[PDB]
Design an enzyme around this catalytic site. Sequence first.
Site, PDB file in Angstrom:
ATOM      1  N   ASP A 165       1.894  -7.508  -8.535  1.00  0.00           N
ATOM      2  CA  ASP A 165       1.712  -6.406  -7.728  1.00  0.00           C
ATOM      3  C   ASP A 165       0.190  -6.169  -7.571  1.00  0.00           C
ATOM      4  O   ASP A 165      -0.323  -5.778  -8.344  1.00  0.00           O
ATOM      5  CB  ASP A 165       2.411  -5.225  -8.828  1.00  0.00           C
ATOM      6  CG  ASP A 165       2.407  -3.653  -8.918  1.00  0.00           C
ATOM      7  OD1 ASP A 165       1.790  -2.880  -7.448  1.00  0.00           O
ATOM      8  OD2 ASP A 165       3.495  -2.947  -8.889  1.00  0.00           O
TER       9      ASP A 165
ATOM     10  N   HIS B  24       4.857  -5.103  -6.294  1.00  0.00           N
ATOM     11  CA  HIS B  24       5.790  -4.349  -6.512  1.00  0.00           C
ATOM     12  C   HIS B  24       7.184  -4.300  -5.507  1.00  0.00           C
ATOM     13  O   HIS B  24       7.292  -4.946  -4.800  1.00  0.00           O
ATOM     14  CB  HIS B  24       4.996  -3.091  -5.738  1.00  0.00           C
ATOM     15  CG  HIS B  24       4.994  -1.320  -6.045  1.00  0.00           C
ATOM     16  ND1 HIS B  24       5.016  -1.269  -7.422  1.00  0.00           N
ATOM     17  CD2 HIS B  24       5.747  -0.173  -5.547  1.00  0.00           C
ATOM     18  CE1 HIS B  24       4.616   0.445  -7.972  1.00  0.00           C
ATOM     19  NE2 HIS B  24       5.501   0.885  -6.223  1.00  0.00           N
TER      20      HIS B  24
END
Length: 233
Positions: free
Chosen positions: A171, A202
């Site tokens: 992420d 994400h």
Amino acid sequence: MLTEGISIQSYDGHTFGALVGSPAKAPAPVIVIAQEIFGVNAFMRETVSWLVDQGYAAVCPDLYARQAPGTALDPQDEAQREQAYKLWQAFDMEAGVGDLEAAIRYARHQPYSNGKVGLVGYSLGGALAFLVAAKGYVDRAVGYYGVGLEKQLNKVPEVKHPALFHMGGQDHFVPAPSRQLITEGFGANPLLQVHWYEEAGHSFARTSSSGYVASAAALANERTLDFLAPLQS
């Protein structure tokens, strides 16, 4: 999409709608679902549906209603992503936590409720899940890939009920030193769990995301279900 007629009042008096799924069999624990940055949209409906299938009722409140009621943005549409980012930038996190508190109170007392309430949040909602866990409003809280969790670590000792967090190792919002701060900070409170998914970034649990990773989504999701299951009864 929201369920017509559902209205929930926040402490400051503001009212907002919600997408509600009643359970297959009552009574059941109720899960409040905290949205991503896109409003109450297809992924929220899919999540309500899933949790109903798993023996919960679910309530997904319209958290952008302070800005614009009934926002439901398609995360594959560039123009709508731009409006999502604008809404997120303007979003009042404190007021969001208040609206979630009111949705949790609503969820406790529905005719189908067994009186236990969980919260599951994704992205924006994952950040809100941590703040709600610090306030202690729910029996169990779950956050997927909240942003800026390394900035909230002073709240770790406030957490008095279990909370579980699923973070993508790739992420971009969470560089290595932030991951280390989160890992160390969470380790001080055994009521907190955080798992890292090394091959995922994400939005890894949403099929429509370019970041979707089926193996990570499935492992995270089964952990979520196992974590919520004690609420059933």
